[PDB]
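Batch manifest, entry 17 of 40.
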Amino acid sequence: GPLGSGGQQPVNHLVKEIDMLLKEYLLSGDISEAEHCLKELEVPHFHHELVYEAIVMVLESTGESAFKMILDLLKSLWKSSTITIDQMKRGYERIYNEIPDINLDVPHSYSVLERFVEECFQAGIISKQLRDLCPS
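Output type: structure tokens
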């Protein structure tokens, strides 16, 4: 019985779906093709992570290239009945509790989150509650 790293099996396949999905979309540039991959799976209890990862993705990035991609990506998924109101709020709240160094160290991401949040406020996907939760 050689080795022995954990008594469980590799079940992190779903995690790769989003990782590859986001990257793929950022490469191609089609929201219709992206949603297609998400439609294949019916796990609404996981998609919540997609939003967060998507937001943080650009938050750390450097350019509006991904900013509009992610924002427009989640925006469509929200009105496409793919991202319930409880999902977005739950995904955004994570940002307020997942910005340890993203804000302090390397001052630039914060300026993005603000624009990303305020931008959604006008889209009609987030209520004053969430927008108010974000630091301005």
